[PDB]
DNA sequence: CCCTATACGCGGCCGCCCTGGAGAATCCCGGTGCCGAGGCCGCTCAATTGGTCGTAGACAGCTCTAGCAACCGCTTAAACG
């Protein structure tokens, strides 16, 4: 609505984080929501691929 | 019937076996001298006693920060089989 489609940061606890992931998958499927966990190589993969 | 050689016992001298009194070596006792140790005395200086005074530290009070017991949760690298 307000065309504020820039980078947004959401910091959540790890235990409730799939309950955020399916909410982003269902209620806002058009958004480019990405998820940030893993070891050094997975975070590097997210960093230089996405 | 008397002399003369002849075999036989043995007085005296020499050598060998058994026992006794005098002297010498040894152990014990008494008197005396020397070394280790204990007691006493003289000097003598440092510990003791008494008093005074300053202050070191105990005590109380207030403020701020580290530690501690017991729990959580995530990561991940180290320990273990």
UniProtKB/Swiss-Prot annotation:
What span is annotated as the signal peptide, if there is one? none
Q: What does the record note as the disruption phenotype of the gene behind this chain? A: Decreased sensitivity to the cytotoxic effects of 6-azauracil.
Q: Which domain of life is it from?
A: Eukaryota
Give the location in the cell.
Nucleus
Its biological purpose is as follows: ATP-dependent chromatin-remodeling factor which functions as substrate recognition component of the transcription regulatory histone acetylation (HAT) complexes SAGA and SLIK. It recognizes H3K4me. SAGA is involved in RNA polymerase II-dependent transcriptional regulation of approximately 10% of yeast genes. At the promoters, SAGA is required for recruitment of the basal transcription machinery.
Q: What is known of its domains?
A: The 2 chromodomains are involved in the binding to the histone H3 methyllysine at position 4 (H3K4me3). The CHD1 helical C-terminal domain (CHCT) binds DNA and nucleosomes.
Q: How does it assemble?
A: Component of the 1.8 MDa SAGA complex, which consists of at least of TRA1, CHD1, SPT7, TAF5, ADA3, SGF73, SPT20/ADA5, SPT8, TAF12, TAF6, HFI1/ADA1, UBP8, GCN5, ADA2, SPT3, SGF29, TAF10, TAF9, SGF11 and SUS1. TAF5, TAF6, TAF9, TAF19, TAF12 and ADA1 seem to be present in 2 copies. SAGA is built of 5 distinct domains with specialized functions. Domain I (containing TRA1) probably represents the activator interaction surface.
Q: Which family does it belong to?
A: Belongs to the SNF2/RAD54 helicase family.
More about this protein? Present with 1620 molecules/cell in log phase SD medium.
- Specify the protein name: Chromo domain-containing protein 1
What's the source species for this entry?
Answer: Saccharomyces cerevisiae (strain ATCC 204508 / S288c) (Baker's yeast)
- Write the gene name: CHD1
Q: Which residues of the full protein are shown?
A: 421 to 470 of 1468
């Amino acid at each position: 609505a307000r065309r504020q489609n820039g980078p947004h940061i959401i910091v959540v606890p790890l235990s409730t984080m799939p309950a955020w992931l399916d909410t982003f998958e269902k209620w806002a499927p058009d958004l480019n929501c990405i998820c940030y966990m893993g070891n050094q190589k997975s975070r590097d993969t997210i960093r230089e691929y996405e």
